[PDB]
Swiss-Prot record, chain A:
Further comment found in the protein's record: Amplified and overexpressed in some osteosarcomas (OS), suggesting that it may participate in TP53 degradation in OS.
Source organism per UniProt: Homo sapiens (Human)
Domain PCI: 1-163
Tree of life domain: Eukaryota
Ranges in a coiled coil: none
The protein's assembly and partners: Component of the CSN complex, composed of COPS1/GPS1, COPS2, COPS3, COPS4, COPS5, COPS6, COPS7 (COPS7A or COPS7B), COPS8 and COPS9 isoform 1. In the complex, it probably interacts directly with COPS1, COPS4, COPS8 and COPS9 isoform 1. Interacts with CK2 and PKD. Interacts with the translation initiation factor EIF3S6 and IKBKG. Interacts with ERCC6.
Record's function text: Component of the COP9 signalosome complex (CSN), a complex involved in various cellular and developmental processes. The CSN complex is an essential regulator of the ubiquitin (Ubl) conjugation pathway by mediating the deneddylation of the cullin subunits of SCF-type E3 ligase complexes, leading to decrease the Ubl ligase activity of SCF-type complexes such as SCF, CSA or DDB2. The complex is also involved in phosphorylation of p53/TP53, c-jun/JUN, IkappaBalpha/NFKBIA, ITPK1 and IRF8/ICSBP, possibly via its association with CK2 and PKD kinases.
Subcellular location: Cytoplasm; Nucleus
Tissue-level expression: Widely expressed. Expressed at high level in heart and skeletal muscle.
Family: Belongs to the CSN3 family.
Protein name: COP9 signalosome complex subunit 3
Swiss-Prot record, chain B:
One Gene Ontology term, aspect cellular component: nucleus
Subunit-level organization: Component of the CSN complex, composed of COPS1/GPS1, COPS2, COPS3, COPS4, COPS5, COPS6, COPS7 (COPS7A or COPS7B), COPS8 and COPS9 isoform 1. In the complex, it probably interacts directly with COPS2, COPS3, COPS4 and COPS5. Interacts directly with inositol kinase ITPK1. Interacts with CAPN8. Interacts with USP48. Interacts with ASB4; this interaction negatively regulates GPS1.
SUPFAM superfamilies linked: Winged helix' DNA-binding domain
InterPro entries, per database record: CSN1_C, PCI_dom, Rpn7/CSN1, Rpn7_N, WH_DNA-bd_sf
Record's protein name: COP9 signalosome complex subunit 1
GO molecular function terms listed in the Swiss-Prot or TrEMBL record: GTPase inhibitor activity
Length: 201, 419
């Protein structure tokens, strides 16, 4: 959000302010997010003018992210090791690998119910079922799966059964949704007023 | 790249002109030992239409493959072919003479028909733009609407051998515009060569190129058996295979009853197409193992189509896709054990296809891969609605602050000055 706003914000120059906004933004888009974020709506011109052609870093980023190649992963890593180092921001490669396992897992999630970790060691790159044991550890660990430790077979059954908002606390989740959107519309009205408040003619 | 189940025997028996040796030499050169035979048939037909470039190309290839088989143990003769070439060029000059005679005659009728006949023998020397401009000019001899009509007709017919589709379909549209093709009675009560159907054939194989095979089999069933015959270039075997297979790869069972289970004009083609018919019957059966079995048994000549070769496996794709759409249609869970018991195919990779299908295909289903079974997901209304609801809510709220701050960046008048 921050960097999409900063970039779609009016701009004409290039900057590693903007370049690294680009950086952490698209890192979110790929490392955090499932895969490539799309072009924002009211983006700045000079980006495509200046910084988008400068954006070869994440051109190859989104490319290799599509590729699912760990070798080319580390190749691009050595490529931009400068930016890796530049602001105590090393480990971005491990971040992209995290997003890799994100892609693999989330892929397998709705597709399966429970799988062999060594087979899925091939699938997600689970590094054998035992490293996949620590991975399933992550699954039940990192807020990662509706599933538990079928340790008899180490099995991990997808559920995705959080709520029908079938607890009123979820209804109040909705309620605070409501709070936000209501005060939002209220300030929309106030500002709409204020444009009406503009000195006309 | 070799494939034996095609019959250009009957085709070069009847189906002629450019595409005769076209498919002959071409589908030959993607099928050795019938490269042998299809090039032999192209050889045999070079005695008509009198082109020698790839003729002597195949002479060369003849000597080549001869020594390749005469390794321990070729002479496609072309010197008398050379003398005959001389004679044919003589005849060409005769034709030029008659041409200019008719020019001096100065007759739309006569000069147009002269363009016609000149192009006709441009067939008989492998002469493309010659006949091309002949008929293109014969276009403009309108003493009758017959001129426009038969112009578009026979020019498209030339393109038939020529392998010319899309702006030959422009010919199609042009002819279909002014003089009301089909004469309000099926070109007056049994359009025999159903001209509009030949137009649809041009469109449908141009879409074999452009991938409109639902539309393809559409126009193909639209193509009826009025003529019962078309020995020029397009077989009823051609259009029938076209319609049946474009249907079975593109249409639904409902369009079958609509169209195929109510197929009569093509029912002539249906009896003409026994085994595509039988594969649609297996569709009715869902004998997916044996269905795709018979499919890829046909696959030999299927690839052997100069038009299906580029699309034969894509159609196999669509076939098994729609097929197993049908297959898991009835079920809330596919025992992958009992699944493959139905299929008798290793559903490891089949399954992998299926997982793609989860990604893309009709899979509203789950698999405990520890279980080795599919489990059709029930389509959620309530909580899926909740999903989308709060999803768009968070999107809207993010964008709420986003547009607030955009109103800021625009009111604050901030722009990143280049210097």
């Amino acid at each position: 959000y921050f960097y999409e706003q900063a970039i779609t914000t009016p701009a004409m120059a290039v900057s590693h302010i903007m370049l690294e906004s680009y950086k952490k933004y698209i890192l979110v888009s790929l490392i955090l997010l499932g895969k490539v974020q799309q072009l924002p709506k009211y983006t700045s011109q000079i980006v495509g003018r200046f910084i988008k052609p400068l954006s070869n870093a994440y051109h190859e980023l989104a490319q290799v992210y599509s590729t699912n190649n760990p070798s080319e992963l580390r190749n691009l890593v050595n490529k931009h090791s400068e930016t890796f180092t530049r602001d105590n921001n090393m480990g971005l490669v491990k971040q992209c690998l995290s997003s890799l396992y994100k892609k693999n897992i989330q892929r397998l999630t709705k597709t399966f119910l429970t799988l062999s970790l060594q087979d899925m060691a091939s699938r997600v790159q689970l590094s054998g079922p035992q490293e996949a044991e620590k991975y399933v550890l992550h699954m039940i660990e990192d807020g990662e799966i509706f599933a538990s430790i079928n340790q008899k077979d180490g099995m991990v059954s997808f559920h995705d059964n959080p709520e029908k908002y079938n607890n009123p606390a979820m209804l109040h989740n909705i309620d605070q949704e409501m709070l936000k959107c209501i005060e939002l519309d209220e300030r929309l009205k106030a500002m709409d007023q204020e444009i009406t408040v503009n000195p006309q003619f | 790249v070799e494939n034996p189940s095609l019959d250009l025997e009957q085709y070069a028996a009847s189906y002629s002109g450019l595409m005769r040796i076209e498919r002959l030499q071409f589908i030959a050169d993607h099928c050795p030992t019938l490269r042998v035979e299809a090039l032999k048939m192209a050889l045999s037909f070079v005695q008509r239409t009198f082109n020698v470039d790839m003729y002597e190309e195949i002479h060369r290839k003849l000597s080549e493959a001869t020594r390749e088989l005469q390794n321990a143990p070729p002479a496609l003769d072309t010197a008398w072919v050379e003398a005959t070439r001389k004679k044919a060029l003589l005849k060409l000059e005769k034709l030029d003479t008659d041409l200019k005679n008719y020019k001096g005659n100065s007759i739309k009728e006569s000069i147009r028909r002269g363009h016609d006949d000149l192009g006709d023998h441009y067939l008989d020397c492998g002469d493309l733009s010659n006949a091309l401009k002949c008929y293109s000019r014969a276009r403009d001899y309108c003493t009758s609407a017959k001129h426009v009509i038969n112009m578009c007709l026979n020019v498209i017919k030339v393109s038939v051998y020529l392998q010319n589709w899309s702006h030959v379909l422009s010919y199609v549209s042009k002819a279909e515009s002014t003089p009301e093709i089909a004469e309000q009675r099926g070109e007056r009560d049994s359009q025999t060569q159903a001209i509009l159907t030949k137009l649809k054939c041009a469109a449908g194989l141009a879409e074999l190129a452009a991938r409109k095979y639902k539309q393809a089999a559409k126009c193909l069933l639209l193509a009826s058996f009025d003529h019962c015959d078309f020995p020029e270039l397009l077989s009823p075997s051609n259009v029938a295979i076209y319609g049946g297979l474009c249907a079975l790869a593109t249409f639904d069972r409902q369009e079958l009853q609509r169209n195929v289970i109510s197929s009569s004009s093509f029912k002539l083609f249906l009896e003409l197409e026994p085994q595509v018919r039988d594969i649609i019957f297996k569709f009715y059966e869902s004998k997916y193992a044996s269905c795709l079995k018979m499919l890829d048994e046909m696959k030999d000549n299927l690839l052997l189509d100069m038009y299906l070769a580029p699309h034969v496996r894509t159609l196999y794709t669509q076939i098994r896709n729609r097929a197993l759409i049908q297959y898991f249609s009835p079920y809330v869970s596919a025992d992958m054990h009992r699944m493959a018991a139905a299929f008798n195919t290793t559903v490891a990779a089949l399954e992998d296809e299926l997982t793609q299908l989860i990604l893309e295909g009709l899979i509203s289903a789950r698999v405990d891969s520890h279980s080795k079974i599919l489990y059709a997901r029930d389509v959620d209304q309530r909580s899926t609605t909740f999903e989308k609801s709060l999803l768009m809510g968070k999107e809207f709220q993010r964008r709420a602050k986003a547009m607030m701050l955009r109103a800021a960046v625009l009111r604050n008048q901030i722009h990143v000055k280049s210097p």
